[PDB]
C-alpha cells in the first residue's frame, strides 16, 4: 500500500529466506563479513562466535577441499556430517559470495543429470506455430515440476502483461484473460529478470531472516543479492502471494535477443522445495526456447506479410473488373477489413463516402474528414487516442478510439481512413476471475476483482497498437487511380 | 529389383560385438532362452552349462535386488567383482534384453558434459546462420568424445548426400566437400536407421558373436537386434569401414518429421569403446540440432515465399495499370526476370510469342508447343534436363538448363513458357558413379569401392535446381495472367 511499491529498489531488501546460509570472504585474507542467525546453526557456533576471526577458522576445510574446483565449476553437492548440501559460489562488489542449501533428501539413485533434457525434448514434436510451443512447454513443466499451477505471460510495447496461457491442476480456478498491469512489477524487477534467468520462492510462510551487520561502511549499504538464489521479495509482493495462498512458486524468464520477451511461472498452493537436479534444466530450456521463439516469430511475421500480400490479390482481381468502383469495393469490404484489423473504413470520393463494419455517424464522417483536411499530413495519420486529439470524436469512443488514415489523393481532398474503437470488446470478458471472494480484501494489492482495474483505466480510451505492414499496404490501395 | 547390397537383413545375421555380452529370458518366470557365445568370461559358468539353466542362480544378486526398479528404468550401473559394468533392458518378440558391457569411469564428468551441451546453446552462436551452428556442433562433439575424424553429412532427394562440415585431427586426410553416391549406404539401412539413432562399432577387426541356438526355435531365425546396441555392423559395411582402415565409428542420425535429413559421422584409426552415458548425452544434441534446423529452415522458406509474393505486388498492380499485357512485359522486361530467378522466358499470345532474354529460336518454340501436348501434364512440369526428354532440346546447349511451361488452360491456345540458361558446376565424388559396384568371389554380394578421390565429377548440360517455392509461384502466375 506504500507509495514506493513501484519505486522501492529491491536491492536494499537485505533480508534472506529461512534456509539460506550467508557466507562471504574478503579478498586475499578471505576475511568474513555480514552473516545471519540461521547460518550459525548449520555450522553450530553462534554468529558472533563466528564473527571476527580468520577465514580458515570459520572454514569447514573438509568442504573447502573442493574450492580449487569450485573456482571453475561454481557448484557441487557435498555430504556434510549433518546432511548433503550444494555448494554455491558467486562474486559481487569485489567480494566472494558463498551459499549452501539442503540438497535432495531423496536418495535419488535415479533421476540423474541430463536425463531431464531427454525426458522433456521428446514432446517437442510438432513445433509449427508460436502458441503450441509454450503450450507444450507448460504441459511438460506440469509433469516435470509436478506442481499445481503454470502461467505464460506476454508483455506489451509498454510492457503491460496479459495472461496468455495456463494449464491448471484439478481443483482450482482458471486465470486466463486478466491483463497484468506493468505497475505491479517495477522496472527494477524487470531488469532482474533480464539479468537473472531463474528465481523461486519455497514458502510464503518463511520469514525475512535478518543479516548482521546490516550496514557496511565501504558501501553504507548491504551487498547486492544478484547471484544469490535466496534473495527475498518485497513484502508487498509477498502479501500478493499470501492473498494467492500459493506458498510455492517458480519462474522462467523469456528474452528476445537482449529484450525480455515475457514470463513463465510455476506455482503450487502447498509449500515444497525443489531439487537442485530439476532446476539446472531450466536455463537450457530458456536458451533453446529463446532461439526457437526468435525463429518462429520471424517466420510468423513473414507469413503474415505473405498473407496480407496475397489478400491484396483478390482486390487486384476486382480492380479492373467492370462495375462501379464503390459497389465493387462494397462487395468485398468485409474481406478488406481484416487486412487492416480496423472494424471499418471509408474513403473520400468527392461525394459521399461509403463505410462498412462499425458505423460512425455519416454527418460525423464528413465533419471529421473536413477536420482532418487542415492538418498537413504528408502521406498518412496514425494514432491510438484519436479522441484525445479531437474531443468531439472522443464523444463517439465506442466506434473509434484509434485509427489509420492515408490520402487517397494528395492534390485533391480525396482521403481514406480505418477506424478502430477502444480495446474492450477485443479481449473477451475473461479479464476477470468472477466468484466474489468471501474474505473481503482491500484488493488494491490483489488481481481477483482488485487489479487490472488500473490496467483497464490505463487502456481506457485507447485502441490497440498499429502495425506498419498495413501502413505500407495503404499505398497499394491508393494506387487504384 | 533389389541388390544384394540393399536387400540385406542385418537384423537377421545375428552378428554381435565381442567385448560386451547379451542374453534374454523365456516366459514370465524369466528363464534362460537366449545364450550368447562370450559368457563364461564374466559369468564364470560354461555357455553350454549356462544353456537351460534358470535366472535364479546365473544372475548377480544385486541384479535381482534392483531389477524391480530396473524394469522401470532399463539401465543399471553394475559394480561386479570383476569391475564396473552396465546393463540395458528392452522387450522384443516377447523376450527380455539383458546385456552387460564395461561402464563409464570418470565420476564427475557428465555434469561437465552439461556445460559441454550448454556450450552448444551459447549466445554467441548462430550469429550468421546454419554453417556456424553445424561447424560448432562438430567441434563440441569432438571435444566431448576425443577422436580422430569428425564430420557431418546431408541427405539428397536421390539420397546421394555429401559433407558440409568437418572436424579433423592434425596430420591426415580431410574428406570435406566430398560427395558420395546414394547406393553407398543401403536403403533398408536408411530405413532401420530411422528407428534407432545409436550405432557404435568398437573395433573394425572385431568378430561377430555367434548365438546358441543358431536360430530361435519359435522364430526360426535370430531375433532382431534393433533394440540392441552391441549389434555388429553388416560385413559389407565392415568392408567399407576397413577400406580406409578406420577402426572405430558411431552413428549420429537426425530427422525432421519421420524424414531423416542428415547424420554425423566419426572415424577413428584406433579401435575404441565408448560408454553408454556419453552416447546418451550426445543424442540430446542431435534432437536439439534437428528441431532448431527445422526452425530457421521454415523461417527462410516463409521469408523467400513472402519475398516472391511481394515481387508479385508491383507486377499485379501494373497489370491493371497497363493497357495490354504484352506491352507491359516489353516495358518491364527486366522486371519480369526475377519472377523465377531465371532470366529468359516467353509466352504465346495465341499466336507469335513475346520472346525476352536468351530465348531460343521461335520455330523451336512452336515445335515445343506442338511437343509436350500429348504428354500428360495437369498444368506444367519443370524439366531440369531437357535433352533426355527430346535430344533436339539438348541441341540448344545454351538453354541446356531447366525448362517449364504453363499453358494457361489444360487445353489452352495461348501459352506461356520459361527457361534457364545452362550453368556449369563442379563437385568431387569419391569412388565412381560410373562403375555400378565391385565384384565379389562367387558374386554372392557386391564389394565396395577402393578409391576415394575426385575424378573431377563436374556437371554438364545441367541446371540450377528448380526449387519448389518457385514452382508454387508458377501457380500464382497460373491464375489467368
CSV table of C-alpha atoms in Angstrom, one decimal, chain A residues 94-461:
chain,number,residue,atom,x,y,z
A,94,UNK,CA,34.8,-7.2,-5.4
A,95,UNK,CA,33.6,-9.8,-2.8
A,96,UNK,CA,33.1,-13.5,-2.6
A,97,UNK,CA,29.6,-14.9,-2.1
A,98,UNK,CA,29.2,-18.4,-0.7
A,99,UNK,CA,26.0,-20.2,-0.2
A,100,UNK,CA,24.8,-23.7,0.9
A,101,UNK,CA,21.4,-25.3,0.9
A,102,UNK,CA,19.8,-28.6,2.0
A,103,UNK,CA,20.1,-30.8,-1.1
A,104,UNK,CA,17.7,-33.6,-2.2
A,105,UNK,CA,16.6,-35.6,0.9
A,106,UNK,CA,15.5,-38.3,-1.5
A,107,UNK,CA,18.4,-40.8,-2.0
A,108,UNK,CA,17.8,-40.2,-5.8
A,109,UNK,CA,19.9,-43.0,-7.2
A,110,UNK,CA,17.8,-42.5,-10.4
A,111,UNK,CA,16.7,-39.1,-11.9
A,112,UNK,CA,20.4,-38.4,-12.6
A,113,UNK,CA,21.8,-35.4,-14.5
A,114,UNK,CA,20.9,-34.7,-18.2
A,115,UNK,CA,18.1,-37.3,-18.2
A,116,UNK,CA,15.8,-34.4,-17.7
A,117,UNK,CA,16.5,-32.9,-21.2
A,118,UNK,CA,15.9,-36.3,-22.8
A,119,UNK,CA,12.7,-36.6,-20.9
A,120,UNK,CA,11.5,-33.1,-21.9
A,121,UNK,CA,12.6,-32.7,-25.6
A,122,UNK,CA,10.6,-35.7,-26.8
A,123,UNK,CA,7.2,-33.9,-26.5
A,124,UNK,CA,8.6,-31.1,-28.8
A,125,UNK,CA,7.4,-33.0,-31.9
A,126,UNK,CA,5.3,-30.6,-33.9
A,127,UNK,CA,6.7,-27.1,-33.2
A,128,UNK,CA,4.8,-25.4,-36.0
A,129,UNK,CA,3.3,-22.1,-34.7
A,130,UNK,CA,4.0,-19.9,-31.7
A,131,UNK,CA,1.3,-20.7,-29.2
A,132,UNK,CA,1.7,-24.5,-29.2
A,133,UNK,CA,5.4,-24.2,-28.4
A,134,UNK,CA,4.8,-22.6,-25.0
A,135,UNK,CA,1.6,-24.7,-24.6
A,136,UNK,CA,3.6,-28.0,-24.8
A,137,UNK,CA,6.4,-26.3,-22.7
A,138,UNK,CA,3.9,-25.7,-19.9
A,139,UNK,CA,2.4,-29.1,-20.2
A,140,UNK,CA,5.9,-30.7,-19.9
A,141,UNK,CA,6.7,-28.5,-16.9
A,142,UNK,CA,3.5,-29.7,-15.3
A,143,UNK,CA,4.8,-33.2,-15.1
A,144,UNK,CA,8.4,-32.2,-14.5
A,145,UNK,CA,7.8,-29.8,-11.6
A,146,UNK,CA,4.7,-31.8,-10.5
A,147,UNK,CA,3.1,-28.7,-9.1
A,148,UNK,CA,-0.4,-27.1,-9.2
A,149,UNK,CA,-0.2,-24.1,-11.5
A,150,UNK,CA,1.6,-22.7,-14.5
A,151,UNK,CA,1.5,-19.3,-16.3
A,152,UNK,CA,2.6,-18.0,-19.6
A,153,UNK,CA,2.6,-14.2,-19.9
A,154,UNK,CA,3.5,-11.9,-22.7
A,155,UNK,CA,4.2,-8.2,-22.3
A,156,UNK,CA,3.3,-5.1,-24.4
A,157,UNK,CA,5.3,-2.3,-26.0
A,158,UNK,CA,4.9,-0.5,-22.7
A,159,UNK,CA,5.4,-4.0,-21.1
A,160,UNK,CA,1.8,-4.4,-19.9
A,161,UNK,CA,1.2,-8.0,-19.0
A,162,UNK,CA,-1.6,-10.4,-20.0
A,163,UNK,CA,-2.4,-14.0,-19.1
A,164,UNK,CA,-1.6,-15.6,-22.4
A,165,UNK,CA,-1.6,-19.3,-21.4
A,166,UNK,CA,-2.0,-21.6,-18.5
A,167,UNK,CA,-2.7,-25.3,-17.6
A,168,UNK,CA,-4.4,-26.0,-14.2
A,169,UNK,CA,-4.2,-28.9,-11.9
A,170,UNK,CA,-7.7,-30.3,-11.0
A,171,UNK,CA,-9.3,-28.4,-8.1
A,172,UNK,CA,-8.8,-24.7,-8.7
A,173,UNK,CA,-9.8,-21.8,-10.9
A,174,UNK,CA,-8.5,-20.9,-14.3
A,175,UNK,CA,-7.0,-17.5,-14.6
A,176,UNK,CA,-7.0,-16.9,-18.4
A,177,UNK,CA,-7.9,-13.4,-19.6
A,178,UNK,CA,-6.7,-10.9,-16.9
A,179,UNK,CA,-4.2,-8.2,-18.1
A,180,UNK,CA,-1.3,-7.8,-15.7
A,181,UNK,CA,-0.6,-4.1,-15.1
A,182,UNK,CA,3.0,-3.2,-15.7
A,183,UNK,CA,2.9,-1.1,-12.5
A,184,UNK,CA,2.9,-4.0,-10.1
A,185,UNK,CA,6.2,-5.4,-11.4
A,186,UNK,CA,8.7,-2.5,-11.4
A,187,UNK,CA,11.4,-1.7,-13.8
A,188,UNK,CA,13.9,-3.0,-11.2
A,189,UNK,CA,12.3,-6.4,-11.2
A,190,UNK,CA,12.2,-6.3,-15.0
A,191,UNK,CA,15.9,-5.7,-15.0
A,192,UNK,CA,16.4,-8.5,-12.5
A,193,UNK,CA,14.5,-10.9,-14.7
A,194,UNK,CA,16.6,-9.8,-17.7
A,195,UNK,CA,19.9,-10.4,-16.0
A,196,UNK,CA,18.8,-13.4,-13.9
A,197,UNK,CA,17.2,-16.3,-15.8
A,198,UNK,CA,15.8,-18.1,-12.7
A,199,UNK,CA,14.3,-17.4,-9.3
A,200,UNK,CA,11.9,-19.3,-7.0
A,201,UNK,CA,10.2,-19.0,-3.6
A,202,UNK,CA,9.9,-22.1,-1.4
A,203,UNK,CA,7.3,-21.0,1.2
A,204,UNK,CA,5.3,-17.8,1.8
A,205,UNK,CA,5.3,-18.7,5.5
A,206,UNK,CA,9.1,-18.2,5.5
A,207,UNK,CA,10.4,-15.2,7.4
A,208,UNK,CA,12.9,-12.5,6.4
A,209,UNK,CA,15.9,-13.8,8.2
A,210,UNK,CA,18.0,-10.8,9.2
A,211,UNK,CA,21.6,-10.1,8.2
A,212,UNK,CA,24.2,-8.6,10.5
A,213,UNK,CA,26.0,-6.3,10.3
A,214,UNK,CA,23.1,-4.8,8.4
A,215,UNK,CA,25.2,-1.9,7.0
A,216,UNK,CA,28.9,-1.9,6.0
A,217,UNK,CA,30.9,1.4,5.9
A,218,UNK,CA,32.5,0.6,2.5
A,219,UNK,CA,29.1,0.8,0.9
A,220,UNK,CA,26.9,2.4,3.6
A,221,UNK,CA,24.5,-0.2,2.3
A,222,UNK,CA,24.4,-4.1,2.2
A,223,UNK,CA,25.7,-6.4,-0.5
A,224,UNK,CA,23.8,-6.8,-3.7
A,225,UNK,CA,21.9,-10.1,-3.8
A,226,UNK,CA,22.4,-10.6,-7.5
A,227,UNK,CA,24.0,-14.1,-7.7
A,228,UNK,CA,22.0,-15.2,-4.6
A,229,UNK,CA,19.1,-17.6,-5.4
A,230,UNK,CA,17.8,-16.9,-1.9
A,231,UNK,CA,17.1,-13.2,-2.4
A,232,UNK,CA,14.0,-12.1,-0.6
A,233,UNK,CA,11.0,-10.3,-2.1
A,234,UNK,CA,9.3,-7.0,-1.2
A,235,UNK,CA,6.7,-7.5,1.5
A,236,UNK,CA,4.0,-6.1,-0.9
A,237,UNK,CA,4.6,-8.9,-3.4
A,238,UNK,CA,4.8,-11.4,-0.6
A,239,UNK,CA,1.4,-10.2,0.6
A,240,UNK,CA,0.2,-10.6,-3.0
A,241,UNK,CA,1.3,-14.2,-2.9
A,242,UNK,CA,-0.3,-14.6,0.5
A,243,UNK,CA,-3.6,-13.4,-1.0
A,244,UNK,CA,-3.0,-16.0,-3.6
A,245,UNK,CA,-2.3,-18.6,-0.9
A,246,UNK,CA,0.3,-20.1,-3.2
A,247,UNK,CA,3.3,-20.8,-0.9
A,248,UNK,CA,5.3,-22.5,-3.7
A,249,UNK,CA,6.4,-20.5,-6.8
A,250,UNK,CA,8.9,-20.8,-9.6
A,251,UNK,CA,9.6,-18.6,-12.6
A,252,UNK,CA,11.2,-18.7,-16.1
A,253,UNK,CA,12.4,-15.6,-18.0
A,254,UNK,CA,11.6,-15.0,-21.6
A,255,UNK,CA,14.1,-13.0,-23.6
A,256,UNK,CA,14.3,-11.8,-27.2
A,257,UNK,CA,17.9,-11.0,-28.2
A,258,UNK,CA,18.6,-8.6,-25.3
A,259,UNK,CA,15.0,-7.7,-24.9
A,260,UNK,CA,12.9,-9.6,-22.3
A,261,UNK,CA,10.0,-11.3,-24.2
A,262,UNK,CA,7.7,-12.5,-21.5
A,263,UNK,CA,7.3,-14.6,-18.3
A,264,UNK,CA,6.9,-18.2,-17.5
A,265,UNK,CA,5.8,-19.1,-14.0
A,266,UNK,CA,5.3,-22.2,-11.9
A,267,UNK,CA,3.2,-22.4,-8.7
A,268,UNK,CA,1.8,-24.7,-6.1
A,269,UNK,CA,-0.5,-24.0,-3.1
A,270,UNK,CA,1.4,-26.1,-0.6
A,271,UNK,CA,4.9,-25.3,0.4
A,272,UNK,CA,7.5,-27.5,-1.1
A,273,UNK,CA,11.2,-27.3,-2.1
A,274,UNK,CA,12.8,-28.1,-5.4
A,275,UNK,CA,15.6,-30.5,-6.2
A,276,UNK,CA,18.7,-28.9,-7.5
A,277,UNK,CA,18.7,-31.5,-10.2
A,278,UNK,CA,15.4,-30.2,-11.7
A,279,UNK,CA,16.4,-26.5,-11.8
A,280,UNK,CA,19.5,-26.9,-13.9
A,281,UNK,CA,17.4,-28.0,-16.9
A,282,UNK,CA,15.7,-24.6,-16.9
A,283,UNK,CA,18.4,-22.3,-18.2
A,284,UNK,CA,19.0,-24.8,-21.1
A,285,UNK,CA,15.2,-24.6,-21.6
A,286,UNK,CA,15.4,-20.8,-21.6
A,287,UNK,CA,18.2,-20.8,-24.2
A,288,UNK,CA,16.6,-23.3,-26.6
A,289,UNK,CA,13.1,-21.7,-26.3
A,290,UNK,CA,14.7,-18.3,-26.9
A,291,UNK,CA,16.3,-19.3,-30.2
A,292,UNK,CA,13.1,-21.3,-31.1
A,293,UNK,CA,10.9,-18.3,-30.5
A,294,UNK,CA,13.2,-15.9,-32.3
A,295,UNK,CA,13.0,-18.2,-35.4
A,296,UNK,CA,9.3,-18.8,-35.0
A,297,UNK,CA,8.4,-15.2,-34.5
A,298,UNK,CA,10.4,-14.2,-37.6
A,299,UNK,CA,8.7,-17.0,-39.6
A,300,UNK,CA,5.2,-15.9,-38.4
A,301,UNK,CA,5.9,-12.3,-39.2
A,302,UNK,CA,7.0,-13.2,-42.7
A,303,UNK,CA,3.9,-15.5,-43.0
A,304,UNK,CA,1.6,-12.7,-42.0
A,305,UNK,CA,3.2,-10.4,-44.5
A,306,UNK,CA,2.7,-13.0,-47.2
A,307,UNK,CA,-0.9,-13.4,-46.2
A,308,UNK,CA,-1.5,-9.7,-46.5
A,309,UNK,CA,0.2,-9.6,-49.9
A,310,UNK,CA,-2.0,-12.4,-51.0
A,311,UNK,CA,-5.1,-10.6,-49.7
A,312,UNK,CA,-4.0,-7.8,-52.0
A,313,UNK,CA,-4.7,-10.3,-54.7
A,314,UNK,CA,-8.5,-10.5,-54.7
A,315,UNK,CA,-8.6,-6.7,-54.6
A,316,UNK,CA,-6.4,-6.6,-57.6
A,317,UNK,CA,-8.7,-9.1,-59.4
A,318,UNK,CA,-11.7,-6.8,-58.6
A,319,UNK,CA,-9.7,-3.8,-59.7
A,320,UNK,CA,-10.0,-3.9,-63.5
A,321,UNK,CA,-13.3,-5.9,-63.4
A,322,UNK,CA,-16.3,-4.0,-64.6
A,323,UNK,CA,-18.9,-2.1,-62.5
A,324,UNK,CA,-18.7,1.0,-60.4
A,325,UNK,CA,-15.7,1.1,-58.0
A,326,UNK,CA,-17.7,1.9,-54.9
A,327,UNK,CA,-20.1,-1.0,-55.2
A,328,UNK,CA,-17.3,-3.3,-56.3
A,329,UNK,CA,-15.4,-2.5,-53.1
A,330,UNK,CA,-18.7,-2.7,-51.2
A,331,UNK,CA,-18.9,-6.4,-52.3
A,332,UNK,CA,-15.6,-7.3,-50.5
A,333,UNK,CA,-15.4,-4.6,-47.8
A,334,UNK,CA,-15.8,-7.3,-45.2
A,335,UNK,CA,-12.8,-9.2,-46.7
A,336,UNK,CA,-10.8,-5.9,-46.8
A,337,UNK,CA,-11.5,-5.1,-43.1
A,338,UNK,CA,-9.2,-7.8,-41.6
A,339,UNK,CA,-6.4,-6.7,-43.8
A,340,UNK,CA,-6.1,-3.6,-41.5
A,341,UNK,CA,-7.6,-5.0,-38.4
A,342,UNK,CA,-9.8,-1.9,-38.1
A,343,UNK,CA,-13.5,-2.6,-37.7
A,344,UNK,CA,-14.4,-0.2,-40.6
A,345,UNK,CA,-13.1,2.0,-43.3
A,346,UNK,CA,-14.2,4.7,-45.8
A,347,UNK,CA,-12.7,7.0,-48.4
A,348,UNK,CA,-13.4,10.4,-49.9
A,349,UNK,CA,-14.8,10.0,-53.5
A,350,UNK,CA,-15.5,13.7,-53.7
A,351,UNK,CA,-19.1,12.7,-53.0
A,352,UNK,CA,-20.5,10.8,-50.0
A,353,UNK,CA,-18.1,8.1,-48.6
A,354,UNK,CA,-19.2,4.6,-48.0
A,355,UNK,CA,-18.2,2.6,-44.9
A,356,UNK,CA,-18.6,-0.9,-43.5
A,357,UNK,CA,-18.2,-2.6,-40.2
A,358,UNK,CA,-19.0,-0.3,-37.3
A,359,UNK,CA,-20.9,2.8,-38.4
A,360,UNK,CA,-19.9,6.2,-37.2
A,361,UNK,CA,-22.4,8.9,-37.9
A,362,UNK,CA,-22.5,9.9,-41.6
A,363,UNK,CA,-22.6,13.7,-40.9
A,364,UNK,CA,-19.9,13.0,-38.4
A,365,UNK,CA,-18.0,11.3,-41.2
A,366,UNK,CA,-17.9,14.4,-43.3
A,367,UNK,CA,-17.2,16.6,-40.2
A,368,UNK,CA,-14.2,14.6,-39.3
A,369,UNK,CA,-13.0,14.5,-42.9
A,370,UNK,CA,-13.2,18.2,-43.0
A,371,UNK,CA,-11.4,18.5,-39.7
A,372,UNK,CA,-8.6,16.2,-40.9
A,373,UNK,CA,-8.2,18.3,-44.0
A,374,UNK,CA,-6.3,21.2,-42.4
A,375,UNK,CA,-3.6,19.1,-40.7
A,376,UNK,CA,-0.8,18.7,-43.2
A,377,UNK,CA,-0.1,15.0,-43.1
A,378,UNK,CA,2.4,14.3,-45.9
A,379,UNK,CA,1.1,10.8,-46.5
A,380,UNK,CA,-0.8,9.4,-43.5
A,381,UNK,CA,-2.1,9.7,-39.9
A,382,UNK,CA,-1.9,7.0,-37.3
A,383,UNK,CA,-2.9,7.2,-33.6
A,384,UNK,CA,-4.3,5.1,-30.8
A,385,UNK,CA,-6.0,8.0,-29.0
A,386,UNK,CA,-7.8,9.9,-31.8
A,387,UNK,CA,-10.3,11.0,-29.2
A,388,UNK,CA,-7.6,12.9,-27.2
A,389,UNK,CA,-6.7,14.7,-30.5
A,390,UNK,CA,-10.3,15.6,-31.2
A,391,UNK,CA,-12.6,15.6,-28.1
A,392,UNK,CA,-15.9,15.7,-30.1
A,393,UNK,CA,-14.9,12.4,-31.7
A,394,UNK,CA,-13.8,11.2,-28.3
A,395,UNK,CA,-17.5,11.5,-27.5
A,396,UNK,CA,-18.0,8.8,-30.1
A,397,UNK,CA,-15.5,6.5,-28.5
A,398,UNK,CA,-17.2,3.0,-28.9
A,399,UNK,CA,-16.9,3.4,-32.7
A,400,UNK,CA,-13.4,4.9,-32.9
A,401,UNK,CA,-10.5,5.4,-30.4
A,402,UNK,CA,-7.5,4.9,-32.6
A,403,UNK,CA,-7.4,4.8,-36.4
A,404,UNK,CA,-5.2,4.8,-39.5
A,405,UNK,CA,-5.6,7.3,-42.4
A,406,UNK,CA,-4.0,8.0,-45.7
A,407,UNK,CA,-4.6,10.4,-48.5
A,408,UNK,CA,-6.4,8.8,-51.4
A,409,UNK,CA,-5.2,11.7,-53.5
A,410,UNK,CA,-2.5,14.2,-52.3
A,411,UNK,CA,-3.6,17.1,-54.5
A,412,UNK,CA,-7.4,16.8,-54.2
A,413,UNK,CA,-9.1,16.3,-50.9
A,414,UNK,CA,-9.6,12.5,-51.6
A,415,UNK,CA,-8.6,10.6,-48.4
A,416,UNK,CA,-9.3,7.3,-46.7
A,417,UNK,CA,-9.4,6.0,-43.1
A,418,UNK,CA,-9.5,2.9,-41.0
A,419,UNK,CA,-11.3,3.5,-37.6
A,420,UNK,CA,-10.9,1.2,-34.6
A,421,UNK,CA,-12.5,1.8,-31.2
A,422,UNK,CA,-11.2,1.2,-27.7
A,423,UNK,CA,-10.0,-2.3,-27.0
A,424,UNK,CA,-12.8,-3.5,-24.7
A,425,UNK,CA,-14.7,-5.9,-26.9
A,426,UNK,CA,-11.4,-7.1,-28.4
A,427,UNK,CA,-10.3,-9.2,-25.4
A,428,UNK,CA,-13.0,-11.5,-24.1
A,429,UNK,CA,-14.7,-11.0,-20.7
A,430,UNK,CA,-12.2,-13.5,-19.3
A,431,UNK,CA,-10.3,-10.5,-18.0
A,432,UNK,CA,-12.0,-11.1,-14.6
A,433,UNK,CA,-11.9,-14.1,-12.3
A,434,UNK,CA,-15.5,-13.8,-11.1
A,435,UNK,CA,-16.5,-15.8,-8.0
A,436,UNK,CA,-16.6,-12.9,-5.4
A,437,UNK,CA,-14.2,-13.8,-2.7
A,438,UNK,CA,-15.9,-14.3,0.7
A,439,UNK,CA,-13.0,-12.7,2.7
A,440,UNK,CA,-13.1,-9.0,1.7
A,441,UNK,CA,-9.7,-7.7,0.7
A,442,UNK,CA,-8.6,-4.1,0.2
A,443,UNK,CA,-7.8,-5.6,-3.3
A,444,UNK,CA,-5.6,-2.7,-4.2
A,445,UNK,CA,-2.9,-5.5,-4.0
A,446,UNK,CA,-4.9,-8.3,-5.5
A,447,UNK,CA,-5.7,-9.3,-9.0
A,448,UNK,CA,-9.0,-11.0,-8.2
A,449,UNK,CA,-11.5,-8.2,-8.7
A,450,UNK,CA,-8.9,-5.7,-7.5
A,451,UNK,CA,-6.2,-5.4,-10.1
A,452,UNK,CA,-6.5,-5.0,-13.9
A,453,UNK,CA,-8.7,-2.1,-12.9
A,454,UNK,CA,-5.7,0.2,-13.1
A,455,UNK,CA,-4.8,-1.6,-16.3
A,456,UNK,CA,-8.3,-1.1,-17.8
A,457,UNK,CA,-8.2,2.5,-16.7
A,458,UNK,CA,-4.8,2.9,-18.4
A,459,UNK,CA,-6.0,1.3,-21.7
A,460,UNK,CA,-9.3,3.1,-21.3
A,461,UNK,CA,-9.9,5.4,-24.3
